[PDB]
Amino acid sequence: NTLQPGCNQACYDRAFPISHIRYWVFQIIMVCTPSLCFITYSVHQSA
Amino acid sequence: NTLQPGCNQACYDRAFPISHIRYWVFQIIMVCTPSLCFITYSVHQSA
């Protein structure tokens, strides 16, 4: 509720520094990483 | 600096309850009144 240009951008950036969806995507990939490491090590071990 | 309807009216009314010009007009008439009283009394006294 204002007429000042640029207030919307600043206030939105302050309210939501990082969106939930991106945080959850990062979390999913990071949590799945160790299994990927184990599988790749297993592949390397054989042949 | 706002988007709220009716904020301009309220804020202007609070800032300037009475305009200067109206106050000065009232002052001028009131200050001139006693001379009018005296002149009318003088007219009444004669004839």
Side-chain angles (χ1 to χ4, degrees):
Chain A
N1 193 313
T2 188
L3 270 177
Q4 184 70 46
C7 185
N8 272 6
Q9 282 81 2
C11 292
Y12 175 84
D13 187 66
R14 191 68 181 195
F16 306 105
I18 296 156
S19 194
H20 301 172
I21 187 61
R22 276 164 274 288
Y23 180 88
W24 290 328
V25 167
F26 182 82
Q27 153 171 9
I28 284 167
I29 304 318
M30 263 297 255
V31 168
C32 285
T33 275
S35 301
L36 199 69
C37 216
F38 180 59
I39 291 311
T40 278
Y41 166 90
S42 161
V43 164
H44 165 90
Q45 196 74 328
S46 303
Chain B
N1 191 312
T2 188
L3 270 177
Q4 184 70 46
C7 185
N8 272 6
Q9 282 80 0
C11 293
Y12 175 84
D13 188 68
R14 190 89 206 172
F16 306 105
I18 297 156
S19 194
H20 301 173
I21 187 62
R22 263 135 261 170
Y23 181 87
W24 291 328
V25 166
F26 183 82
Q27 152 170 10
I28 284 167
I29 304 318
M30 263 297 255
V31 157
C32 286
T33 275
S35 301
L36 218 64
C37 257
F38 182 59
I39 289 280
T40 279
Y41 168 90
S42 273
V43 163
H44 166 90
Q45 201 74 314
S46 304

